[PDB]
Subunit: 106 residues, 4 copies
């Protein structure tokens, strides 16, 4: 999928997590977010189209996804332990990573 | 230092971060928590004293600290960007990692 | 792409890197291996098809890819520095990771 | 300990790994290398004391240690599997990380 498609999947699933009632629903949404994040990672965003692949900016862009994926990983552990409210809180808190990257590269 | 001492350091700095007025205070506190987590990471907790250093339990224990350290790292980005409330919120959220490891190994 | 196809992509590029004489070739090859490794993570291998998504086996399987991805990342740093032979050795190095997962989950 | 002494621990143990005759000796030295690398992470090199802990340089310096620690973790897995020759080759290979950082910040 292209970058924007994966971003939509990321955004859609955050909403699903916010309104979910049980752990299974949260786990499923988080799993989809992980796949979308990883798929997004191979993209070169418009704002960095003219930068070299080895540029500090592309390295930072990639690092942003690593941070996100890590937060998704931790959230999954919480969901897997049936801690719905905590997993939901983790999904909400990681919005700060979405924001940080957007400020720099969206 | 002893596992328990690093744990005391982690607990106290969560309080320092909560009471912080500014970004500098939160950064310093996160930095201290990082040191404590990495030092605590080489210890053998009492409940796993009978386990081989190479065991699923000790690998998971080690992984738990990696999760915590990754959260401190993300929180540090927020504080370094002057986002005091966000960094404070990130510190609050990572309490779930503290709790998750305790439930299994404390 | 599916698990098997991403694997063939990993194998083909490892061979490309081995025959490479310039950094551009190595960079391109690792780039493709990174995309393939990440794409493969969304897959559930046949051997773990009937194990819970949160099983220790699935967490270990995921860990294997993280180790692989990290090795690719380290190799890319060397490739981007024009250190061809160093990058090639890093690529050869990680075959041990390929083998480890295969013995356990293939 | 300080940055300098932890670096000594890293250097000495690499020699121990090269001279090692069994898996346990290698695992033991790698374990000491991990502790030293992590403990080392809490330091600001002389050449970066002028840079903010928030600069791209300080972040890159920090990242370097994470790369090294990841390579140590992967080497541990090999040593734990009794693959002495392989673990020795991993140790030899991670020397590129040692050099890559030194070139920039030593
Ligand atoms: C879960 C967190 C995230 C959410 C919910 C999210 C959501 C979105 C949405 C709704 C869009 C606009 C979609 C469109 O233009 O069609 C977008 C765009 C974008 N996102 Fe994110 N995003 C997240 C994390 C990230 C991260 C971590 C990075 C960087 C490492 C990033 C980089 C981008 C870029 C570069 C664009 C612009 C794409 C374009 O206009 O071509 N995003 N994101
Ligand atoms: C910021 C998060 C954390 C906080 C605030 C925290 C706080 C504490 C505190 C106050 C204690 C009691 C110490 C004592 O009574 O002497 C403790 C014990 C312990 N913590 Fe944590 N901890 C955190 C994260 C972790 C993590 C991530 C792990 C595991 C990966 C962990 C493992 C333990 C263990 C095993 C003990 C018991 C030590 C013993 O009884 O000897 N902690 N922690
Ligand atoms: C660069 C390292 C790797 C290379 C070169 C590689 C290569 C391959 C190749 C060529 C195949 C298909 C062989 C056949 O047709 O029978 C394969 C299958 C497989 N690999 Fe890997 N692999 C690597 C790493 C990994 C890792 C790290 C894991 C696990 C974490 C893994 C899990 C699997 C599994 C589960 C299969 C079987 C898929 C199926 O039959 O449906 N591989 N790999
Ligand atoms: C296992 C790999 C490594 C080995 C064997 C190693 C070894 C050493 C040695 C022997 C020294 C000289 C100590 C002295 O002055 O007495 C040194 C210095 C230093 N190392 Fe490493 N090192 C390694 C990895 C790293 C990495 C990954 C970084 C960067 C992230 C790094 C950064 C430094 C710096 C900045 C110094 C200068 C210290 C000073 O000026 O006091 N080293 N290293
Ligand atoms: Ca759009
Ligand atoms: Ca104690
Ligand atoms: Ca106190
Ligand atoms: Ca201070
Ligand atoms: Ca095929
Ligand atoms: Zn995990
Ligand atoms: Zn960072
Ligand atoms: Zn890097
Ligand atoms: Zn491991």
């Amino acid at each position: 999928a292209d970058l924007e498609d994966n971003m939509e999947t990321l955004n859609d699933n955050l909403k699903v997590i916010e309104k979910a009632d049980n752990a299974a629903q949260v786990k499923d949404a988080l799993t989809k977010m992980k796949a979308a994040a990883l798929d997004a990672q191979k993209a070169t965003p418009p704002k960095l189209e003219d930068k070299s692949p080895d540029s500090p900016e592309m390295h930072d862009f990639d690092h942003g996804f690593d941070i996100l994926v890590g937060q998704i990983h931790a959230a999954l552990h919480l969901a897997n332990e049936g801690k719905v409210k905590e997993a939901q809180a983790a999904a909400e808190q990681l919005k700060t990573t979405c924001n940080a990257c957007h400020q720099k590269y969206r």
